[PDB]
Amino acid sequence: GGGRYPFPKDVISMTGGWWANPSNWKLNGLFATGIAVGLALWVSTATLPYTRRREGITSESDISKWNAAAGVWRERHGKISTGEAA
Amino acid sequence: LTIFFGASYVATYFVPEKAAIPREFPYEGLWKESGGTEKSKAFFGQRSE
Amino acid sequence: PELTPAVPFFQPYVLKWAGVSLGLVAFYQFNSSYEAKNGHTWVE
Amino acid sequence: MYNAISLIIILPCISWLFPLFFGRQLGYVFVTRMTSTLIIITTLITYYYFYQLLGNNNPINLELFNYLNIDYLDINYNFEIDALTITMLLAITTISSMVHIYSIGYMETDPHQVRFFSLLSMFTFWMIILVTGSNYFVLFVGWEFIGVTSYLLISFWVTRLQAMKSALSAVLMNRFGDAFFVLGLCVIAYVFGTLNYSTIFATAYLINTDLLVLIMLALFIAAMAKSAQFGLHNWLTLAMEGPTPVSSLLHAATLVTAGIYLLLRSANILEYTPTVLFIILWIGALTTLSAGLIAICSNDLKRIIALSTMSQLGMMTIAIGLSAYNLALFHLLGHAFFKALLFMSAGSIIHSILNESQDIRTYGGLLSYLPYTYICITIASLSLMAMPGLTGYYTKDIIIESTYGSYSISNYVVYWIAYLSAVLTCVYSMKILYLTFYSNPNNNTITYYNAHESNIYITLPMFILAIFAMFAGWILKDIYLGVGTDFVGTHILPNNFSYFDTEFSITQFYKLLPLISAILVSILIVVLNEFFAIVFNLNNKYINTVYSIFNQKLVSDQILNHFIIFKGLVTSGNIAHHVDKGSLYRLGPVGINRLLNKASYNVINLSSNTRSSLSMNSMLILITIVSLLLLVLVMNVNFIIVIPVLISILYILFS
Amino acid sequence: MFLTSILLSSLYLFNRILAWQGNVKHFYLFASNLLLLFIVVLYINFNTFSNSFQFNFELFNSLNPFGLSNSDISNGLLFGIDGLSLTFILLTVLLIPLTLLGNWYNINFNSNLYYTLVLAIGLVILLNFWALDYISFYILFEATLPLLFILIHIYGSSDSERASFYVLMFTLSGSLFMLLSIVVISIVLNTTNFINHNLFVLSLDLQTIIWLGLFIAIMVKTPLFPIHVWLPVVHSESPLAGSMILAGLILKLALYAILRLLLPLLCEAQILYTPMIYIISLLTIILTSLATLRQIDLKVIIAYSSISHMGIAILGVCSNTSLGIYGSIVLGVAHGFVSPALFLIVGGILYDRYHIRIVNYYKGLTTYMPQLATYIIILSFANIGTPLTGNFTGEFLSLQGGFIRNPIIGGISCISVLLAAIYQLKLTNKLTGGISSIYMHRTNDVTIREKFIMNILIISTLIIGICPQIMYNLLYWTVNNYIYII
Amino acid sequence: SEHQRPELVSFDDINYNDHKKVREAQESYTREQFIRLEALKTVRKALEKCYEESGPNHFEDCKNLAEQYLDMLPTHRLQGYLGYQRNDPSK
Amino acid sequence: FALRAYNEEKELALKQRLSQLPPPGKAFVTAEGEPRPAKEAELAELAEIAALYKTDRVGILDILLLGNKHARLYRDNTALLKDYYYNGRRILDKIPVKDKQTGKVTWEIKREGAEKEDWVNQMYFLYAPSLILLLIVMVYKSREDITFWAKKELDQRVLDKHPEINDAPENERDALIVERIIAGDYDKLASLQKKATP
């Protein structure tokens, strides 16, 4: 290629090295694309049940009941809201 | 740094007056919608009206 | 663009790591299914 | 079998890791194309999610496995793409896409393209993680890992010592901020009992203002590190040692925005910490003015553009200080586009010169040689100068106006500070344009014989980003700056909302002086440089000293290196040599050794004379009996008197 | 069948193996992995829903000195494991075979003695985690010093004589004050056992005296400022197995000793004294880190690095907060993974190739030694506390606890996050960065063995950093057993 | 599943030489503090839900839950058995 | 690997068969540090004694049964084989490979297999799977943490105090348990603090 220099051929990195472009890269790229598409499909399909929207999951009646129970607890324990001590 | 912050401080005395009052909000300053309980108005209540 | 010598894809580290990881994932899923059809995982 | 959020998270991780696993097997060709393609798909998915969110605005969540659940501290790997997040992701994915396609042509003939593309996607993945997390812990994960990736990308050319030192500067100056972030996390977990956004922003209106001020001061010092505000700005210009695509992605549009994202996510706490907003405002005002003053007296192109980025981040922080979070968000999104375009243009310019020089004093007249680069860089510079119709106008003029529209009386000065930084951006962009394109030649002749535009992989990104930097602001105006938009639903306090006053109170002078000032100062700088160039070349010692301070980054990298770093190394040597290898060895193996040498020698050189062994030891019996009898007399008389007698006897025996 | 028949089978097999092949390292590695597997089986058979001590056994009883006791009068040494013990026991059995394999090919003179001493130190440390009285703990806490003296003296570097004398004398100095403490405990209570020693409430004025001796021992063993100067020399001039064992397990014996000897007993003295602990810990953090910034020897730099993280662990364990205890334990485990990996890099990879440790010779390993550079970067960013490693989890929770206990000291201690980065990356940047050194010829990259060790130690820390919660089933009692709050 | 429900022992009713009852009491104290924590986490989860459903109405709708969470956080936490084992509050 | 593969005569010949050769350290160098200085008959000789290092010359039932005088012979003429093998492997950068049919072995280049280290079978098949087992055990013992037990217990206490929840629909009981938890105090810690009530 252009702008190239000698390099030690016995240096082995998990990345390429110096201008890595082996003469089988279409087959290996086919393998890598297959593994990548499969991994992406697996992760998406398996993470579908762990997704949710922010809103519309809990009825506001549940929210009303929980806030009312909170008030019940707060006056059972004899507590006043923030700022009322003045 | 001293030039910057000293000039910044000096320039505050040469500031024009505002032309409109701040905004004001209907229900006694939205103390309920901001989390008040009729004794917490001074803490959570916004401007008068 | 100049070429380099061929390099096989499934070198030993690929096989080892992918095999152990996918096998642990499969064992996890199998134990989950066991608890779905029983009341206790297989390892328990 | 379709998850926008999960595809968005996992595809960049694939693009990062599969090169690292399979690079020797795949090569740089396939790695480049694959990483590109995966980021392109993530970008399209983000655009579709943005469309759907404008339609509905019910954010998707992704609640995965549990990190730590010990005692009141429940941290999970939870993710979410809300309005703020999807905006940040538009920026991230778009600029990473364009940078990936740009670095195919830029970094050709580099032997280490595989690692470069792996690291670009590493940064993309961890920034997606930073923005999508639903708690501060995931944010910190992304924070620290983008710091790691910045170190490695600035250190990409490992044989260059200055690149290594610049990367060390970046990583340590950011771990300063990460230390303060860790302090903030500890305070949050103490006060709130949780690091999740939904509880903190539900309770924040009730907690003592002092604790929130502590939290937000710490997180703001973290953001002060990342966003290159003044006190911690020294790494951003040094990071230009890295390749230009890194400069376009990280240190223009993405990494420096993490601090802004932090402050914008924590807006719902900052509304109850007015002190910290004040500090943010004035630090940003200092930053925007001082970066411009440094840029106008700089001579390297990438440094000028980095300081431009610094100034725009300062203006974003001004907007945060004025409780104008949506404005800072909008300017972040626009700045990403037109600044990435600027850096890409600078890279093409740098590659048009045979010796890839970056000094504007050695470019000259490259207009007819580089016309496409010229129109792209001037599009970006006009969308940075805030000229009408472009994204800079809609994104930047509103902040200079909100300076005046703020209910606080003191913010009027910030109008003038921001105004001067604007009329300075006009200067330090027109300088670039003149010295690079319009001026007379300053290079040799072979440079202009071999000057040429670069390949499609460079130009197509520049085209797309120019389209963005022309239209996206007008598109997204009513989303971000409109009247009552509700898209980015940050709960601003009603007392602090100044937009309605900002658009109306503003009179003609304070609305037109920025634009008219730009359109005049640009013409004046061009005209002076072309006809009256002596104005900038007077050779006065008192002008040149001021130029030299402004050319040495406001002697900011000399104060840090000498009075902090070097004195720290000296104090560290003082510790290591005078305490850890001095006094603590004296109260230790050395002093005990000398003490025992002397004491042993005195003990054995007591029976002095070997001439007669009998008389000597006989005298010792006599002395022992006499001394004991008198000592027992003395202790019967009173005890404490015998103590110094025994001390002196030990002295005589052992000294 | 017989007990003696089975161990005589093992003994005869060992003798014949030594007769035919004149080396012991294969048999010791087989026993290494066998012990690991047996401990995993014990964890399989461990009830997490009982805070009690399990797998108890007593030795050297009056009625059966060469066997186990079933007596109604117990006068021997007690043994048994809690979840806290089992955590560090898992760490120990994980590390022992790696310490044997880290010196597989670089010991070419009196090999069998080296491997015997290494395995013996490891088994003493295991049994020390199994102990359930002050005296068995002590006799296994001090029994490593002869072996370490001999190992470091015979198989050590240039300055090995000084290091041998240090590792014995400093530790003996602290441990004899520990012995005075233990003697006082035994004569006052007439009992020494870690089961019911929180039932005996001593007077405050005597707790405050016993605590002094125990804490002097903990200060010399942890180490803590001002008694930290032996650790650079010892960890530097030792063989690789010694440094790994030391930094991974013997430094953690002090943490375990706090939690097992000093907090359950002596609660009121501890709750009165802990601001002094915080003074000492903050000093130990900041001054040791800054001292690291001006060191010229690599293994010495890593040695100094251990001290600051142990100081953060001390902040956590002396915090009276559950999160702090859990963080200190995770720090111990993750440091026991990461620091021996760094010691391997700087004492078995580079030292085996160049036989020198001065930083001025090393530069630009990335060119010929790229895998090593990747490992250095990973382990550096793990040692300084990057998230998704157990180091960050432990640091985070220890500093949480320190802030809860003393916000000012615990907040000032968070500059650890910075100073760690400085002293680690100033070294990493030079080693991995620049043009390759003119003082060094080219040598092989990391081998499959070295890579095996480093990969085990990286996988472990990444597992416990990505999901720290997997360690809670053996610690959800321990995080509440040593908390004094009314 | 065979979910266990052990018997509750107090330190005030036992003799500390019977170690079984002492361990039962330690485990009782710790177990009830963990149940307190699960109550706190239920409150926090409800607060999160009401915040995520209400939005700008959370200041009014989630008020009692927020105040309850901040009232419970200092007290519903792990605080160890030794402080009560080794101290008689009646003296 | 074999059971009973010891054969006295070849060892007792091999002793001085190797003593007639030069020392292992100085053989492949010649004191001039050159493989060429060694003669080529000597080189093939060294190759075929070195290939005898990785041959089964003993089994389990021969180490457990035979006497010391034979084991010592095996040991001290196996050390020599080992050292010849590895000194050649380093100096020459060749291993010896006897090919299939021709009965003559000589140093060759091919090093992409046919060589294994002595620590691999121990670790990769006793140590690695034990750590994988430890990971499995940790993951499935995490199911027994007190958080889950406490959740189940608290729900059960609520159901015992309010049995009316159970007849309600099956996907609504959770919210009702949450309501009653938020309302009440089902912990029993002040129950255990009897002497604190004055």
Ligand SMILES: CCCCCCCCCCCCCCCCCC(=O)OC[C@H](COP(=O)(O)OCCN)OC(=O)CCCCCCCCCCCCCCCCC
């Ligand atoms: C009823 C009350 C009784 C209580 C006890 C009171 C103690 C009275 C002690 C007085 C008895 C005489 C002993 C004095 C020490 C003998 C040697 C001496 O004179 O000290 C000097 C020695 C000098 O070192 P250098 O300066 O290099 O040599 C030139 C000296 N002309 O010094 C040195 O080598 C440097 C010293 C550095 C400091 C080291 C401190 C170490 C502390 C631990 C000491 C443990 C060893 C104790 C040895 C016992 C000796 C009796």
Ligand SMILES: CCCCCCCCCCCC(=O)OC[C@H](COP(=O)(O)OCC[N+](C)(C)C)OC(=O)CCCCCCCCCCC
């Ligand atoms: C999160 C858990 C870990 C993730 C897995 C990481 C290991 C994968 C293997 C990487 C192989 C490699 O990077 O090679 C190492 C590269 C080789 O450079 P080269 O491109 O091949 O060209 C070769 C040209 N030399 C030889 C002249 C250099 O040396 C380096 O420049 C040092 C930088 C290390 C990069 C680290 C990768 C990012 C991981 C950081 C996570 C903290």
Ligand SMILES: CCCCCCCCCCCCO[C@H]1O[C@H](CO)[C@@H](O[C@H]2O[C@@H](CO)[C@H](O)[C@H](O)[C@@H]2O)[C@H](O)[C@H]1O
């Ligand atoms: C020096 C090398 C280091 C080795 C360190 C590792 C030591 C590991 C030992 C752990 C095994 C202990 O396991 C222990 O179990 C029980 C305790 O209930 C002991 O006690 C058992 O004694 C037998 C008596 O015939 C009966 O079963 C009795 O009911 C009891 O269960 C066992 O005698 C002992 O085996």
